[PDB]
Structure formats: C-alpha cells, structure tokens
Write a protein that binds this ligand. Structure first.
Ligand SMILES: Nc1cc(-c2cc(Cl)cc3c2O[C@@H](C(=O)N2CCNCC2)C3)ccn1
Length: 337
C-alpha cells in the first residue's frame, strides 16, 4: 500500500517468479529510471515493444496508488508461461531487459547508461609454469556469479573468485605447439561498476552425487562491502567501498515457491520489504541478518559509495517527457472506458 511507505507494489503473478523482484530493484536504480524515460519510443508499437513496456511499468510504479500490472511487459519479450521463467536465471532476464534498453538508447543523449551503471572489466589469464607462454583475455561483465558452498561470506566468495587454480596432473593445460604443460589459471578485477549485481550460486551441479542440488547454507553479506583488495590497481581518490541496496530472496519449494525483494531505495539504511502487491517497512536485520539462512538470498545489489548520490538521484514527475506521459495516459483512458 502506497500511503504507508510511499512505494507501490506489483500485482501478484505466480508465473512471473522473480520478475517483480528484479523490476523493483531496477526501478529504484534511479539513474536507469530517468534514462529509461528519455528513450525515443514514439515510433514503437504498443504491444511488442520491450523499452515502451518497461517505461509503462516504471511510469505506473512512480504514479499509481494501486498495484502495477506486468501483463503487457511479459507479452513484449515472450515469457508468458511459467516454464519460460523456470528455464532462465534472474541475470538472464536482466540481460534481456537491459539489452533492449541499451539498444534503444544508442544515438541519444542517454547512450551508454547501461555500461556506465553496470559494466565492469576483468582479466582472465593462463600462465604456464615451466614454459614461457601466457594467454590474457580481457572481458567485460555486467554481473558476477559468486560461489557459496563452504563459504561463510561474500569476502570468502571474492577470495575464491580471484583464487589461482592449478592446472596439473590429469588436468594439464594444452599449450598448442608446446603441448601438455603445468600451468596456473586465474581471474583479476580491473574495475567494478557503480551498480554491482552479485548472484549467489545456490544451484551447483554435483559431480560425485551426479545431480543438481540446491544449497540452503548460511551465507553472510554485509551492509558495507570493501573490494579494494580484489582489484589489481586501487585508486586513492575513489576506493571500492560499496553499500547494500537490494536483497532478492526466495522461500519454499523450488519450481514454485515465493519470491520477495528487500530494498534500501534512498541508500539511507531505511529498509522496505516488497512482497508483490504489499510494500511494508522493516528492520535492517529483517532485510540483511535474517536472510542469511540456515529462506535464502540469491541476488544482491550493491552500490558504490562514491557513486551513490548520482545513482540514486531524485526522480520527479517532471523527469518523464510529456510526449510519453500523454501516450501512457491515452492508453489509461481507453482501458478505463
Ligand atoms: N539466479 C537465480 C536464482 C533463483 C532461485 C534461487 C533460489 Cl534460492 C531458489 C529458486 C530459484 O529459482 C527457482 C529455480 O529452481 N529455478 C530453476 C533454475 N532457474 C531459476 C528457476 C527456485 C531465481 C532466479 N535467479
């Protein structure tokens, strides 16, 4: 309900699984929201336009007192059934949403907003021990998948993410003309984005048991996350200290269950629980400490301390172009009549 917390829910759809959790998360990434409103969607069709459909949901979440529907948005990228959401991860849905937007924002004042907010950089190397050969590949990433099995916390997950793997014995590195060689494999972070999307791997295929198992283990994530020690080169002027913004939680059975997101929208430590149509205030401990598990958190969103004021900049009704408002209201008039 809007009068309590000032924020509005999304309509209850069991088929959509984790979409409402993602939509709310992306909606309260305010710099993206402003950016999404400026997309030149005039020419796009009312039914099959994902950028327009995201504009509608965002517009409605900003203005509506009643809960917001997502039926038009689901129809725009063709994930109508339950099976569609079941055979995709949350990061993949986010890729589908942000690609459409990123492509629409090309050739505009808002170009490069997605990579500005989300794109970091890393290096993957393979270094041979006893022979002079190295293989560096630079990669962009818009999200990080973290390992949690036998890991107490995020710090240990980042330790494991950058940990050097030893390619030796039966798993020796095929080094081309040099042949089978003992080698070291590893990953190093060059940059970390303003908005950091961390997915926690709670579904590892087990080799010994020979079955996909869910992981219900306790996993601790902090309100503040320093990441300088995991960068190759630290900047004194801009340290990589991050603030917890969102916690996407799942409960109950796999293949149905119940999805909730917890959010810290203004970055000010004042938490709200977004349970589909019901938005309500909650404690830090309900959002953070009580979702450690051992009910499990699967995605976490951190925002960089230095970029917080820009990323969560105040949106108003004036930051939506009139042409878009006129269009969306003209739809709302016809639907009601
Ligand atoms: N990264 C990620 C994880 C989940 C997720 C997390 C937990 Cl702890 C339990 C469930 C989840 O989704 C159900 C499931 O098993 N799915 C089969 C694989 N794809 C997703 C749907 C149940 C959902 C979305 N994105």
């Amino acid at each position: 309900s809007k009068k309590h917390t000032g924020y509005v829910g999304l309509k209850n759809q069991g088929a959509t699984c984790y979409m409402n959790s993602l939509l709310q998360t992306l909606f309260f990434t305010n710099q993206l929201r402003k950016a999404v409103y400026m997309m030149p969607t005039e020419g796009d069709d009312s039914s099959k336009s994902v950028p327009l459909a995201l504009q509608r949901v965002f517009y409605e979440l900003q203005h509506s007192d009643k809960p917001v529907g997502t039926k038009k948005l689901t129809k725009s990228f063709g994930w109508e059934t339950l099976d569609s959401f079941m055979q995709h991860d949350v990061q993949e849905l986010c890729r589908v949403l942000l690609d459409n937007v990123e492509n629409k924002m090309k050739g505009t004042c808002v170009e490069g907003t997605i990579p500005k907010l989300f794109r970091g950089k890393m290096v993957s190397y393979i270094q041979c021990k006893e022979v002079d050969y190295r293989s560096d590949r630079r990669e962009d990433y818009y999200d990080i998948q973290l390992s949690i099995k036998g890991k107490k916390n995020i710090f240990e997950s980042f330790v494991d993410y950058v940990a050097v793997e030893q390619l030796d014995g039966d798993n020796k590195y095929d080094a081309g003309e040099h042949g089978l060689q003992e080698a070291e494999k590893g990953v190093k972070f060059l940059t970390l984005p303003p908005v950091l999307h961390l997915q926690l791997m709670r579904f590892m295929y087990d080799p010994q048991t020979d079955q996909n198992i869910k992981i219900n283990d306790r996993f601790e994530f902090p309100e503040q996350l320093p990441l300088d020690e995991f960068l190759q080169k630290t900047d004194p002027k801009d340290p990589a200290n991050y603030i917890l913004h969102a916690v996407l939680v799942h409960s109950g059975d796999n293949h149905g269950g119940h999805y909730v997101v917890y959010l810290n929208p203004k970055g000010d430590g004042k938490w709200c629980k977004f349970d589909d149509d019901v938005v309500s205030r909650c404690t830090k401990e309900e959002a953070i400490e009580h979702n450690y598990g051992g009910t499990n958190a699967y995605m976490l969103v951190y925002i960089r301390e230095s970029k917080l004021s820009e990323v969560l900049q105040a949106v108003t009704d004036h930051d939506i172009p009139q042409q878009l408002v006129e269009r969306l209201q003209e739809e709302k008039r016809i639907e009601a009549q």
